Symmetry: D6
Subunit: 101 residues, 12 copies
Amino acid sequence: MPIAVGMIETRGFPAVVEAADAMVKAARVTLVGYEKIGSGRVTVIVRGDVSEVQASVAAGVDSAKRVNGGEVLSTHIIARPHENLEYVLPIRYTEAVEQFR
Amino acid sequence: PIAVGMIETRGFPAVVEAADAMVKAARVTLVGYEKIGSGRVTVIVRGDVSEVQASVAAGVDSAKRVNGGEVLSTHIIARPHENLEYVLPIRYTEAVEQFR
Amino acid sequence: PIAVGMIETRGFPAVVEAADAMVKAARVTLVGYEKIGSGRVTVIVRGDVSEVQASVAAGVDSAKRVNGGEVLSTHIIARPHENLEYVLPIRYTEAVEQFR
Amino acid sequence: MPIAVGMIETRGFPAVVEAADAMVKAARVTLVGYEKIGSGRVTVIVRGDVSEVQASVAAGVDSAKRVNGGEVLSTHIIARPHENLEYVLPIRYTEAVEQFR
Amino acid sequence: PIAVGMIETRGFPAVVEAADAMVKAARVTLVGYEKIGSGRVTVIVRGDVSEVQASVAAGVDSAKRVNGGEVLSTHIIARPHENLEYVLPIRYTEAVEQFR
Amino acid sequence: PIAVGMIETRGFPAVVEAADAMVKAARVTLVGYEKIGSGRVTVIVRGDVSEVQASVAAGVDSAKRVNGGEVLSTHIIARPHENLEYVLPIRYTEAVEQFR
Amino acid sequence: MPIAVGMIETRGFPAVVEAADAMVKAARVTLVGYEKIGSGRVTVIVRGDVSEVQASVAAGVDSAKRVNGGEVLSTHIIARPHENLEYVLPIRYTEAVEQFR
Amino acid sequence: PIAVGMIETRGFPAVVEAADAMVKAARVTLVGYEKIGSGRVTVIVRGDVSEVQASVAAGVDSAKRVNGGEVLSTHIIARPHENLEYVLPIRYTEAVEQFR
Amino acid sequence: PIAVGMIETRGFPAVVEAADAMVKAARVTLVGYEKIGSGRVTVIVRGDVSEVQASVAAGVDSAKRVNGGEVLSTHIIARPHENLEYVLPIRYTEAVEQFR
Amino acid sequence: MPIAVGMIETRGFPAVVEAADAMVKAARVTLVGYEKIGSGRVTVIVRGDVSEVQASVAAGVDSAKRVNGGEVLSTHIIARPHENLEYVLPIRYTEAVEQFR
Amino acid sequence: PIAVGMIETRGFPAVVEAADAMVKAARVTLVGYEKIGSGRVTVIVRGDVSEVQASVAAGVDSAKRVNGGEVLSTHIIARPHENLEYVLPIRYTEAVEQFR
Amino acid sequence: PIAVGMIETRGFPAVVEAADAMVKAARVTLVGYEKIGSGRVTVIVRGDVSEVQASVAAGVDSAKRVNGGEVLSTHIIARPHENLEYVLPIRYTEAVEQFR
Ligand SMILES: [Cl-]
Ligand SMILES: [Cl-]
Ligand SMILES: [Cl-]
Ligand SMILES: [Cl-]
Ligand SMILES: [Cl-]
Ligand SMILES: [Cl-]
Ligand SMILES: [Cl-]
Ligand SMILES: [Cl-]
């Protein structure tokens, strides 16, 4: 069975930490990633079963909006990401977080 | 349970004040400083939730009176999930273990 | 003749979708991910020119359908000059060479 | 005895260098730091007795404002900074400037 | 004397097309790629002043066929001072020596 | 007593012209090139105060003639405090010693 | 359940690669590590069930000794390594080899 | 007072055994691993002096029975001077704070 | 099934000759150069088992004729386990893909 | 008054740590440095008044010889080291150890 | 075709003298300096095979006027295989291109 | 004409003495400190050839008088070729340029 990727991007760092906490609390997913691209835009990346990933992104968005100064910019889930993406984009598991799989 | 508190400012002097005020107001440790572009910097403290509540409150109150810059966003997570510390820069460092 | 295709987005989730759509839509290899600041990110693919065309069209389409998605620029070069690969990040990496 | 911290943030590099120059010329403070948070915002940090830091920050803000294209964004002085700050924020002495103490 | 030619774009795909068009139009070597933020990216060529002149003209024209590209500034220096090679990223690299 | 001159531009081609104009206009050494985000880039020269004044004037003049050229700020310090050397990037490098 | 560690140290690189090859061919262990302490001494580290590690270390020492110029210096297996060791010594799984577990 | 204990071996497998045996024999934390050439590696533990005494003793006893290599040198400092930790690699790391 | 061949020498000139002798003698790609101290250096080739056997023989032969040349060890693995790629430096690099 | 440099070189690391502890305990000197040059040769470097440095090197040698497996290779004190040496050789103070001056 | 010439010494001063003597004797470029342990250091020149031959001979002779020097091995490859440039440190660097 | 002088020792305390003696005995600048493994370290000075001679003689003499001192090799090159400074660590650094 495949490993979905879910992503929440926020403007502001405290919002992105709450997004991540809410995601890993709401469903059986692993936080693998935190990406900065400039202009205040930060993305947290989780992996898991497609439906847990759905459950976690919904939770994260709800909670990140209730952060004081919290702004959500974009979200997306990919149920079955192409194998090529792991080797280029920072969406991959690390050994640090492998205990959470 | 070890809480995390965060104050994000516009500008560097405001964030240093946010940090100073946090650690003076309650028994919390300053563990981190994060830059995300657009002049946005966040200072991160850890400690018991009632102490983190007390310090974010003093940090905001003080950082807003800084000549220039602005408090942009703040948040307290009272019982953060294990997983967060292995990805996000909210973890203790050895340099600040002396302050627990 | 290895064509190059690029989709630039404002925002990261949308660039990751563009990448996924591009490699799913045709026989292209995703070789790159480039950040130039200001929320602007570009994913770069390599392959037969007709494949690159199909992939960049699918990628642009899917990326716009992302919640909060913004495509900023896109382009295909059918016959990139050899000098470009030693300066600009459009070259194959060893990690993705299994995907030719 | 307590070593205060003083900070002038400018939009633009030339003005931050002049702020730094005038700070160390105006009083007994060591320039310890130069901090880039991006988006054109640069901060210079001095350390010294609180009364000396106050005088130097005043000179720096005045001279920086007089730079061709000079722009001062924020300033702030902490008289008695908490010890914890130096191990996280770049407000600390470096060995290269210990000489100027 | 080796002239320097520069084209600064907003957006990455536009700078890659500018690069390609420069080296395809004239006997010039693309030596570098500089990011300075605000989405501003410059591609740098070296060669004869007349060849650099033709390459900059092709680059500026070709950049305007890119959807979402914009050329922000350009410049040629016919006889750059030697001091510049050592401070500014306008120098040949070994990776592109084969293109002289 | 070694002066320091700075021209800050918005855009890279224009900073490279400021640098060329400066070193050709008077007896100064270009020591540095500083990037601070938002397209803001500074070229830094060292020399005799009068040489540095001549060169900063020449530099501003020429940068303003770059297509898309923009000068944001300029300054000369005739006699910088020794402390500045060790914190700010205004120092000679070995690669440019050759040019004093 | 406990993941044993197995180590073969050789004098010479080609022999360490063959030790590694034969270890993972002889039993259900993951090669996790390659450690240079200098002076020609290189160690390869496998992880797995203690009975599998024993069989793989035996195969590796035999095949390495049969290398042209092969030289085995030391070997050792720890059945139940203390958890603290992985955070200091390079005996830990990496993400690139998690696949072979 | 926090003691430091050290066992130096010839060879890597012997040192890993030295480390394993130390942490199992008494309440000590493994903080470090040092390589100095000539096949010489040292494992460093911290803890109370009576616990460090107990663990260096078990570490030596076990590491010497390793097939190949040799225990080369050992030492316990019961109350090491502050200064040592800022120069020598005997200090706790954050990765091993969990083991105090 | 891609074999791996290794010649280890004592001395650098001799390892560079082993490498040349190997790539010229048969259809293999030189992928690596490994240093492990005490003057011990290995050159690593990849190819068909029979090509790699031809080339290792050629390499040893030639290295032994270098003035001061010394071959310390050699080995071929016809069908290396996939796990080895990810731990040991026997993998193709992008810079030598050109040569398969 | 000038800052002497004292040095103890040992074969083996536990000996070099004891050398350093004994030096800073015996006299008013600062440990600034630890240098590895290969072949098991490691040097600890202290700074202080010429006579405290003398007192500390004598203490360090005595103690390093009583280390189990302890071997001392070379020592030297320079009362008044040329200013050029700080900028090339690793004998200089660091900010970490400046609290001990 | 660019030949490669190597001289490996024990000791550093002997390798510096070998280097100097090579470039003074013949039309060759010193491109590199390789340390492999055991006090073994190799200096690498490139040029015409006949010029590399003369430089190696001068290097070996001049090395024997150095007190405490010893030449350990030497070798010339007249026509190195292209694959070698990309693995082994025998390639020109930009810093020495001016000496071709 | 900037001569180069080198003293190589087995052991570090002796190399530091050699350096100190060299710069005290004549008008030379200590520019380098080189490690090639195996306990071998070299200090490099630059200056007038007659100065370098005086300094290397004083350095060799003093280094031998160090408790446990061993000089391994020494050499002076009066007129080092220009190519050597871009490859070998014999060049002035900015940090020591105040000592010309
Ligand atoms: Cl913003
Ligand atoms: Cl704002
Ligand atoms: Cl944006
Ligand atoms: Cl701005
Ligand atoms: Cl050996
Ligand atoms: Cl032994
Ligand atoms: Cl030894
Ligand atoms: Cl030795």
